[model samples]
Target: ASMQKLINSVQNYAWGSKTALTELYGIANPQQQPMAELWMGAHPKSSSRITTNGETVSLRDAIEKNKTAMLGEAVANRFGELPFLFKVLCAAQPLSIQVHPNKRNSEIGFAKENAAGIPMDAAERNYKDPNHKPALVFALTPFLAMNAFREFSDIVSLLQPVAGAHSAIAHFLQVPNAERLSQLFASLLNMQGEEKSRALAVLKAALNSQQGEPWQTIRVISEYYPDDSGLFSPLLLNVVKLNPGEAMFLFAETPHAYLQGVALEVMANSDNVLRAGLTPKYIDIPELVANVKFEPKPAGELLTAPVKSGAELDFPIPVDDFAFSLHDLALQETSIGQHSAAILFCVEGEAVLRKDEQRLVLKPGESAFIGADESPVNASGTGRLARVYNKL
Candidate 1:
């Protein structure tokens, strides 16, 4: 195959926006369920399908059958399969406060779970694959998130004003250093029953009395997960507001959560998430604590800087699994070399993609999977497209 059209899978997660995916991506949903993510890679959990010669086949199976022809020989030999998973994530509610394990931790956790005979489909299984998930999100709208920890001094300042009055805030105000931040977070998350309820009430009351960004964040989180300790996360983490075209890179063990917005996400091919709170799913507090990087990350270091490549701009990350780029083609045609298997997603207008004799005209929200052998690829038209592929 040269370049084949893809039929991606949509995840109906509860925190997803009811309109974003449908309205932006042209994803049809008659049942009107919340559409969270549109996955566009060979992840086993929900791999995309490709159409060829009027027949449809799973992208995973196709890659397995023709590794060298689909993925480049180098990529196939090194990764043995697709190494990245691309997605469009639309979050209406706050996602879980979570951290992804590094490669070493992922390997250990995955093997341990398998040795314990935990079924892959079990809700309690923490590591679904033995690969690290370092990701980047390119904002398509006004995006709000809490990414990484704030400076310890800033955290204290944010909570100190309320600590004298609110018991919940007071509990963490005395944390001595960055090392003790995890302990303070653990204490809040572990609070239970009446103790948790009383603390939450005091915090909520304090938040209601105040008016600022922090208070507004607390109000939003409380409305969704009332009495949940995760509402206090804003005081500890750096709140980020990404405008359209802005992007953020999340390294392994960096604790973060999407408060609200739509964005294009690219990550290592893994499903190993260790969540702490703000979700109804299984949360392994110990694992999450163990995996978190306690060091504070300044807000200035969050946004990614892309390197210009012809008509495209590449968002460079410190990983070999994947590379993402954006292309804006207008009246003139631009060429993109296909060094490995690539997925091209059209986000606006219509664009014509060509590789030798093979051709595909992608409309808004349409995508195509270009094989590694589909070299000398060229794209032209008046539209915007996102390209994801392996980095050599």
Candidate 2:
């Protein structure tokens, strides 16, 4: 089938908002589980399925059986598989404080783990595949996150007020440059037992009278992850709030956590994640520290702008694996150029896709997979659509 409807899966993670996915995407979960993510790609862990000749098959199997025809010769030869994974993420609670490794680190880490006889499903395994994961998220609602690090001077200013109360705070303030920032971050992550409790008590006490962004974030995180030292992260990292249609691209080694909100997320086809804190999952401190970049960045640097105009807006990034764009087909029909493979997801209204005689109608929350053989499609209707395809 040149154009096929995709049947995707929802990840019911605890951090997800119970109503966002249901109300927006119409995904039903009568069990009242939190629908964290709606994944629409072939990532072995939860691959979406497509129906052909009345027979249902996994997207991964279909691609493996006919890589060239499905993913196109250029993309198949270059990447050997799907290059991107698309999803709708709902974060009612904060996600883990995590960082993704670059390509070189990923390859080396994956090889090292394999040589050590680490199972793919092992909770301690840090690398699942030898690929870098650079991602972009387009906010659908008011989004909040802790992204990257603030300038050393700014961090010092934020923490100095509390230094008089907590020894850890005083110690962190005394340290200098990126090294001191790293030291402070490491100390917080490595704290244990009574030492951790004592530090938290001091920090909380100092924050009790504080009023502003830092205290607000600390309060929210501490309530959720009471024992997690990552609550102190707001004092170090950039707390970003994105309005609707705003986008952010996170590169390798950037420590970040999605605090709350709903958004459309697209990333390279990899499951490898190195985490430091704010999670019940495995914490690989050495790996996370080794992969993180301690340098500071301005908060404005995190916002991404489109490279195109009118109905189509392309979120540009420095990656060869995937390309993401937003389509606002309010009253005009736009022609989509040919690509290896593409997934068109409707977030609002109705979308009608046509390629010669083949036609597909997608209502709000519905999606369709366009095979490599299908080319030069025209999308017309009133709605917002997110198009994800291979860069080549």
Candidate 3:
């Protein structure tokens, strides 16, 4: 009864309050006005809201007003603030090439500037909090992306033949090795005004003509959108493509960018990001290079658990921060439960979440959030389903 009552207070606020979903989800329908992200967490810049009767209220406002009633004494006492945020992200094109700060990097980076009294809103300001951000993503459809850095040699080998008569390619080839390639990225970042403009033009021309060899998205983007300047993404990042039910984990300081597709994402309760290229946003090349972890292979690929019941997947990163699992229920009756919180998103068919005397049915393009306090809730009905949460 206590959990049910608590659930009632937060449920309406958590799921009912949808803000800028169109913009954040990148829905390109002429009727839909899109921005970039569906902010479901209390990150100040982006927080959720709820509509009650005929009035709309901020979710944070509701939480602060009804903290005791909504979170319950025990649960509120253990978790001081909402420890994570949930999101439904739709990236039609590439996002800016970026990296998050690791614990040590964040602490030092934040404190040094704080001591100097730099304003939080200052364009030069970086760290919002001294927390290492680790994130997990499960593809709702076929998703493609580039994460981390591969050996410079591998990328150099790919570029050498393509450079051919291209001036940019020739510039890259004259360099003795991979370290220089990495240095070249740093060099491009340091360039500004006309210098930056000229460099981007050269890169774009090459991408426009390079054929025969597999067109690496990063390289292609770099070469074609040299103005984008994120063209160097190929040399410094690892590319990944995930089919349905597949997932990947990216630790802090690992540079990456989502190429395309929609997905359900969960991450540590922080929004601090340092971007290098591929957007109009501030480019902090020096900071990005300092925080990058250049792994030759993709980090944290998931291991799937075979089941007669359904599908369960485990990602490589280790931490209570979060874990993702997928289950496709084809039968008329099936169930799932026991987690701190469960997000049931229907990718196909239809299903219902039942507990005690209540039931919530979700159809395609719809989702429900089951709080940590409410577990062992029976999920049944015919269709497909995915269960995601922070692994406690």
Candidate 4:
């Protein structure tokens, strides 16, 4: 009675891959539309579903029905429902250069926008929910991304006397501190004359020249957007490539973008994003510049080191909304002691979850919810399972 198979929501953003979802999970796509993301939890925008005896029910409503049983008592009391949103992100192209507000800022921004009488769907609207977003992406395939700011000196060196970084170069070189870099980035996002104009020339020259890290990446980005100011992102932010099974975390107040790859993303259930560039979407420049942290985040720190326990490798994420781990299921029956509400999704092969006489088959890309009531259950099969839960 505690297990329910889920029908997750699929998002079709233009940047999504055409084959990953279908080839990896056998999810159909005869139309060949871009299958971007598969949202696996109770997000207000799109809630996953459960078919109970032929009657379909939303996961959000299902949690509301029995709050304490579905989610643990403490979890229900604090959040009133599931606090985390789990996702499968498949990007064939790059996403926007964006930053999320912290909790206090989110609350403030949400109220300010609402007080201004701005509609939720308005082009100027930024914050969709009043919660901070802190998420990590575990690579399912080779993953590429740009996150945070590079060291101030490194940035100046790359764009020294170059077209885009030409004008503001003087302002930054005086003092290579957080404040200087902050001012420097702020100018790039806000200014017009030189910062946004010369990037097209730089992109063209780079395309015809060497194919190095930030150079090669910016070239790929140019195919989707040639004239956008986001061309400066690769040079400003640290470029990272994740081999399969590696991970990177996205913290609040940091500008980041996910480039080509398929990954498992779990984050606090929020939709607050201040876009900086790379799409035809509206960008509230002042707000984005104000919220983004300008401190350099080294590429080495971005790769997370998971703590291993038997067959499970747990990620140490700072946020309280979610905890993620990968478990290897094999011939030996492993007991996953249930403490709170959790979601189990199979990534490869087939895993069987059993509670007494009840059984659920978890195939690749298949997922099921394990309510708090299902305790001390056994899981075994010839596959791998990904688990998402609240804090212990």
Better of 3 and 4 by TM-score: 4
Which lDDT tens digits does candidate 4 get at residues 227-339? Answer: 77777678788988899899888999999898789999999877778887787788887788788887888767888899999988889888878888888999888987656
Q: Which candidate number would show the highest lDDT if scored against the true structure?
A: 2
Query: Largest TM-score belongs to which candidate?
Result: 2
Clashing pairs in 2: none
Candidate 4: 10-residue stretch with minimal lDDT:
160-169
- Mind sharing the TM-score for model 1? 0.94
RMSD of 4: 1.8
Tens-digit lDDT track for model 3 on 272-351? 78887777777677777777664455334432332334443345446565555555655444556644545556656776
Model 1 agreement with the true structure over 28-50: per-residue lDDT tens digits: 88889999988999988788999
Reference-based TM-score of each model = 0.94, 0.95, 0.77, 0.95
Assess each prediction's global lDDT (C-alpha) against the native. 0.84, 0.85, 0.58, 0.83
The Cα error of candidate 2 at residue 334, in Å, is 1.4
Instruction: Give candidate 1 misplaced runs (Cα > 4 Å).
Output: 164-172
Judging by lDDT, tell me the better candidate of 2 and 3: 2
